[PDB]
């Protein structure tokens, strides 16, 4: 609990580097080994300088075998195959699989061998033989015997605590979700052939409102079984480089008022789910450690006839909120065995 | 040929002038703003979002010359003090944002003033509110002050009408993901109107903001009065917006029925598309609302349905197209 | 009427096609690109920076119907197997990138192929570089393959040439304040190219970057070889750029002389303006370069002068427009 | 502990306040602006470009509490009417933009007023204009009104001073690629100041604009008087800027010498770097100026040299860091 889990990161892209950054400020968790195929000098620079998350809090120098991050050495390997990483050499109990390739059960568990690691957390959905965990919503399902788990998506970690609070208090019949989302790496900087064939993600990301699909509301059942098949949604990608907001319009079993809804969210608040009545904007949530931040100023309960539509809304940094939730799950999972 | 005056040569005003060049039977002979003719002539010629002007503009003393024809410019702060009649001006496009009630808009009507006024915004409940090809039939021609509604109203109305006529609307909640506007601050600072969100850098944030378009839809479609509410998320595009509506309907429907209904309701004001477009693709369109079949949802859970419908609009040109159709028609029954 | 083939339907190819619709006496009868035609058709119809396609585009078997006329759209990987002569194609705009040398580009030349080729890339010593209305007099017509230079070269060249011809250039440094481009990451990440600056979010940063358009000006203006160097600052506009040249000249000058000289050098490729414009005003212009007299500076300190001289260009449509001109002309000689 | 007034709680005002929390012996006891406490308290807590406030801010009657300690807020439009003396205020940060001359700034000095004024801007040619760690030695403590110069002057001066000291400057032209600021319109509209370029949408354009910093360098470095001129290109980032200087020198140099000379001159105000950084990397820095060795060019052509040196600055936090340093020093010698 104050015990410091030694952590490996595989793939030092956006999620890896931010996971690293987050881990400096949540100790009782420590990265001793990074693995990635790109030039360590390219990697050091991108750890140091970050457009949206700011300059690194400290110092980063390239040394033989790794980095000195504020004095402390950290090993950087470039082993292509997960089977070939001697994690146990550097005390590494658990691995954050963040490449984007090794995202099934049988691929990720190649990290497990006598010189490898005990456990693995994947940064995508794993399917349905790999448990899916949003911290402080459904992390109770972990018994400790599991070899590989998933941290869900950025959108799922925002929606989950907000949806869970609606279910436990009032009961959700059905709901539709709209995420107003920062542009992401899967969009073209300028109009051009998207190698996925998506005609919308082919368009200039920082110059357009771009509608896009998302499976977060449809696959919410993996995290909250009571809402399986009850939620659907979509996204509007807009020109901010990070920071997002999720609106849920739902029909509930119980009658409610705005005040009841907000107070129920305030009472559900914890390290993962924040609360605020400050009329904030997206730039204010960049770098937060909440997985989701409910905003009471945007709540609506529309009673027309007997019938009620309820609008809820929660902010999230699709980068750092997600990262923070992932580090929370990576800590807890390593501390059961 | 009806002679039109524009009070407020801003985004809506300047673009109304641009459209009026292609409307035979309507002509602008007076502009009133707060600035010199050279500022206004420059801003007509060059437009960041809507492109270079189609023609010639040259500055003169007391006005400017658009393709040879002189148009008078004045900088009178007060509506009552504008001598519209001097220039032959019968109808005024009130496009400043400051005289958007019946009382205030009527100051334009006096001796040597104008006969009639079209507000480019909600004008309160005691002004008639016209979305062209939805409720422009309600005009007899004896009105002094009418409203052309808001931009978001002109998007939502034909879409919500189509849902009501075909299926019946129980209730509904609207989100408009909307371009930033001139009432937002370019960088964080004191908002004169007290808004803590519009005080923030408009091109660097997703900014929640309130909107009355759904709440006041009763003024355009009486049968929907009290049934719709909503809000906005202002985002970093300089123009171009989209309206999502989530609704419970009286009749059970499918995605295909809903889209076909919309296509059938299509006209000059209400577009239909199945192309998966983005906001830049609607900049400068002449529809007041462009329905997008690619974003329609119909979610059935335990026999109950939620219906999602989405229409694009250029908050600038889409509104302005509607405004000028409503002007053209209002002039011809005056 | 010159029948044209476009090998590579990326930003350039697509705009070349769009341009060619309006400068007729030049026509596109065959497009060849390995991308799914439905993606290509969609990108032709809708363009973020250059607006909607002027016309209609529908995907048909083997090609597109663009406003009535059918255009064949093949996906030949190899240049020697495109049967250009089956669609009357005289001249090929090589815009793929893969076939940028002479011997690669001239595989388009065979009995069932084309007669001539214009690469969009910079040639390899034995391929002539051509800015239209600057050095297109060097083309005798016997050449098989030529280059149309870069976007920046097409902006700089007519401005530098007028400096040389009127005054004489000793040396110079160039800075381009440039739209972000497709070789920049949308968000911070590892980049093919290795550039730690192009690895950064392009629409959220000022990003210094290297250019050789000044260093390679010798190829277009022999008198300026070795005399100009430069660099760029990529900034958050999706298209539109501006080129600043600070030069020592052989002759003493005034700001008025400099400006009237540029005005005298004006033509279809080199525009001249005295309006205080901004980048959005040059989006989609057909000039290769647009001299801005309002930014001219001549700083006399002691006996000595530094002359600052500035030009706008749509790094997209300006370069494209210059490339369709070169393409038209090179075809009409044989 | 000297007690300080801020007039204008804007970008510079609020960041100055922020920096003063960590400066022992300086303390803000009064803020004056044109709006209520809740607006100002909100804009302090939440900052788009500079992040959340480091502390607690709570609104009260007549002011707000910052980590417990109360700060009075008034809304007095005229400097002559502000009773600074009531709150112990001796020195005023004149940060509104509207009282930026010796004469206008002096209106804070009266019975019940303040003792001394620091303008957060150029204040004309009869006022001591200080760039900290370049010429703050000129302050004796008897001055009533001083200027902290402009953002761009605080960037340019240490770079130009090292060039003078080590090698001697003949003449020089400056281009600053600059963030947009609050004097630009968020969308195309009449600019109150009459500037036809600042009228344009600032987050959607490259906007040329004038700047007096280069010409006024004589106030800070007398030996460079009349030798420097420049201009700006305002571009779509909300903060962060960079200054390119092209100079002919008296001594011949190499790239290596030039960079070594900058690193020698390095201090708390003048940073030195060799990392290929971009504008977001300098947001929030405490350096007034940050030299970038990677962009140094020395071009030699026929014996003759043009030298290019480039320094970064957060027009917001870099200037403010410089301003508060000058404020801290001025207050100690008063
Ligand atoms: N831009 C949109 O998206 C949009 C859409 C629909 C409706 N509207 C409405 O249209 C109106 C104008 O909006 P806009 O976006 O064009 O704003 P804008 O700021 O571009 O235009 C306002 C213009 O009015 C001028 N002005 C202000 N006070 C004046 C006075 N007393 N006399 C004369 N001129 C004066 C200003 O100088 C400016 O040119 C508002 O009511 C707004 O709600 C705007
Ligand atoms: N922002 C920059 O990058 C920057 C850098 C260096 C210097 N400056 C200079 O600093 C000054 C302020 O710039 P800013 O960007 O902070 O502007 P800003 O618009 O953010 O702030 C101006 C503030 O002054 C207030 N104000 C206006 N008139 C007033 C009055 N009569 N009394 C009291 N308050 C009044 C406004 O409400 C606002 O809060 C200007 O002189 C500017 O040139 C700005
Ligand atoms: Mg007409
Ligand atoms: Mg203090």
Author numbering:
A (entry chain D): -1 to 335
B (entry chain C), C (entry chain B), D (entry chain A): 2 to 335
Copy out sentences from the published article reporting this entry, exactly as the authors wrote them.
GAPDH plays a key role in glycolysis and gluconeogenesis by catalyzing the reversible oxidative phosphorylation of D-glyceraldehyde 3-phosphate (D-G3H) to the energy-rich intermediate glyceraldehyde 1,3-bisphosphate (1,3-BPG). Recent studies suggest that GBS GAPDH is a major virulence factor and a potential vaccine candidate. GBS GAPDH exists as a tetramer. Each GAPDH subunit is composed of two domains, and consists of 13 helices and 2 β-sheets of 9 and 8 strands.
